[PDB]
Amino acid sequence: NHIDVLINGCGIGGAMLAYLLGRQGHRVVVVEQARRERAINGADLLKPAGIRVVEAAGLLAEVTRRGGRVRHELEVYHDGELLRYFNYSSVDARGYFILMPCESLRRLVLEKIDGEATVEMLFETRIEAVQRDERHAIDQVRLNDGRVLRPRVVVGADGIASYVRRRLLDIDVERRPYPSPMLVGTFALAPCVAERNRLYVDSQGGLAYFYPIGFDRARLVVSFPREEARELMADTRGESLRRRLQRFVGDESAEAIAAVTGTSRFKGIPIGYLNLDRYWADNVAMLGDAIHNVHPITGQGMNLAIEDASALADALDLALRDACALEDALAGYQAERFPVNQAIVSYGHALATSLEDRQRFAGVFDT
Ligand SMILES: Cc1cc2nc3c(=O)[nH]c(=O)nc-3n(C[C@H](O)[C@H](O)[C@H](O)COP(=O)(O)OP(=O)(O)OC[C@H]3O[C@@H](n4cnc5c(N)ncnc54)[C@H](O)[C@@H]3O)c2cc1C
Ligand SMILES: Nc1ccccc1C(=O)CC(=O)O
């Protein structure tokens, strides 16, 4: 019943890790509490560092074949006037980003895992209990199907409310909510949205970000102070939201506003602030939202899960092929990822708290 790696969670992070380890013939069991087909919804953005992972995994061609869109521009408006235009390819030819729904990319990765004979995905399954040895390493894990496994490594890829973090590592994280929630809705695609990503903010705390997703749809991500957000979502025919948008979204995006036909299909987006001091202990390591939570205004939640998965796959491959001890590989993982994750967590908070103040917001961008 010896395996190399037990991964708790089959989100984008855990799926990517499973796939990269499986490609090397490592014996992997992935435990996921949900059904495989549970349509989750998540982040839509891949940044250059995430794209590098997807490309190295051999998946980049397939991403655009399945509705992923290459982009290299963003317009940012404040109080209806253009504050910044960013052209990410204006120095770096490979500066581009990709818009790809998390669930589409995850389905692609699962299709690859289906072809890897050393990886076993267990859906509608959870860990029940673990047993530690005299060195304090997890050596036996019992699942709620009664299966017992003996993994060399246990990974928490189990997201924002990580079971591994809370129940195996005994970490409690301080909750510090933001006063403005964020919501995302999917609408018909207007030509203006097809043309260029446009982010709008105003001095009263409003945010509206319009961008295309898949072949023939568009997202609108909004943020308002909580009580206002409540009132705008309550008028379900969308008239209050559309008129609030018209206060800070100019006519370039008028057709995108008109596409907002109601509010009933908006979904909340979680908003945390976290970067754990330790990404690992003993033979247990964590990735993605289990270890950090970035403000979703950064767009980077999926991207950082993928970057972490790739780093952790590198570290675990070294340890499992006996190129170094596990504790040294896990320390190297943390050395590599902690600074990157820390910068984006700090930057997300700096963006979210500067929105209303035009000069400060611009200053956060310039870095
Ligand atoms: C609707 C929505 C919109 C979002 N939009 C944005 C955005 O605009 N910008 C942004 O930066 N981020 C956004 N996010 C956050 C982003 O998707 C996450 O950062 C990303 O999914 C993290 O990936 P992960 O693999 O670490 O965790 P997840 O994708 O959360 O995957 C974790 C997996 O673990 C499983 N799991 C949990 N507990 C257990 C258990 N006990 N046993 C077994 N399995 C378990 C879950 O079922 C899940 O499949 C959004 C999230 C949502 C839901
Ligand atoms: N990148 C962003 C910038 C401002 C507001 C929201 C987002 C996102 O929410 C993108 C995503 O869905 O990953």
Q: Which of 241, 269, 297 is the last residue of a domain?
A: 269
Helical (H) or strand (E) element with 53: helix 48-56
The CATH number for 342's domain is: 3.50.50.60
Q: Distance, CA 184 to ligand 1 centroid (Å)? A: 15
Q: Which of 269, 292, 327 is the last residue of a domain?
A: 269
How many angstroms is the resolution? 1.7
Interatomic CA distance for residues 278 and 211, integer angstroms: 36
Interatomic CA distance for residues 211 and 199, integer angstroms: 9
Is residue 265 a part of any domain in this protein?
yes
Domain span including residue 250: 182-269
**Breaks in the chain listed by the residue before each, with C–N > 2.5 Å:** none
- Beta strand 148-156 with 138-143: parallel, antiparallel or unpaired? antiparallel
Q: Smallest Cα–Cα separation from 100: which of 158, 58, 49, 42?
A: 42
In this structure, are 120 and 10 located in the same domain? Answer: yes
Interatomic CA distance for residues 161 and 181, integer angstroms: 18
Q: Smallest Cα–Cα separation from 31: which of 4, 13, 6?
A: 6
Q: Hey, whose CA ends up nearest to atom 37 of ligand 1?
A: 158
Interatomic CA distance for residues 28 and 219, integer angstroms: 36
Mapped onto helix, strand or coil, the DSSP state of residue 6 is strand
Backbone φ/ψ region at 80: left (φ over 0), alpha (ψ -120 to 50), beta: left
Mapped onto helix, strand or coil, the DSSP state of residue 97 is strand
CA angle, residues 228, 231, 234, in degrees to nearest 5:
145
Mapped onto helix, strand or coil, the DSSP state of residue 204 is coil
Experimentally, the structure was elucidated by X-ray
State the DSSP string of 120-168.
EEEES--EEEEEE-TTS-EEEEEETTS-EEEEEEEEE---TT-HIIIII
Is residue 56 a part of any domain in this protein?
no
Six-digit token string for 224: 């308002």
Interatomic CA distance for residues 232 and 222, integer angstroms: 11
In this structure, are 292 and 328 located in the same domain? Answer: yes
Give the list of residues 6+ apart from residue 12 with CB closer than 8 angstroms, or none.
42, 102, 105, 106, 109, 288, 302, 305, 306, 309
Q: Which of 269, 300, 335 is the last residue of a domain?
A: 269
| 248 backbone dihedrals φ, ψ, rounded to 5° | -145, 5
In this structure, are 314 and 346 located in the same domain? Answer: yes
**Residue pair 290/156 in contact by the 8 Å Cβ criterion:** yes
Going edge to edge, which strands form the sheet with 267-269?
81-87, 73-78, 198-201, 207-213, 217-223, 182-188, 267-269
The number of distinct structural domains making up the chain is 2
In this structure, are 165 and 195 located in the same domain? Answer: no
State the DSSP string of 255-278.
HHHHT---STT-EEE----EE-S-
Burial 276-297 (b: 16+ CB within 10 A, else e): beebbbbbbbbbbbbbbbbbbb
| 232 backbone dihedrals φ, ψ, rounded to 5° | -70, -40
In this structure, are 286 and 350 located in the same domain? Answer: yes
Hey, what's the torsion of the CAs at 222, 226, 228, 229, to 10 degrees? 40
Q: Smallest Cα–Cα separation from 15: which of 322, 332, 279, 40?
A: 40
In this structure, are 308 and 199 located in the same domain? Answer: no
Ligand 1 pocket, 159 CB below 6 A?
yes
Residue ranges around ligand 2 (CB below 6 Å): 43-45, 199, 209, 221, 296-297, 299
Please name the amino acid found at residue 354: S
What percentage of the chain's residues is helix, strand, coil (to nearest 5)? 40, 25, 35
In this structure, are 194 and 206 located in the same domain? Answer: yes
In this structure, are 139 and 153 located in the same domain? Answer: yes
Q: Is 296 annotated as a binding residue?
A: yes
Is residue 355 a part of any domain in this protein?
yes
Is residue 60 a part of any domain in this protein?
no
In this structure, are 289 and 147 located in the same domain? Answer: yes
Interatomic CA distance for residues 250 and 274, integer angstroms: 35
Interatomic CA distance for residues 35 and 42, integer angstroms: 16
Q: Hey, whose CA ends up nearest to atom 53 of ligand 1?
A: 42
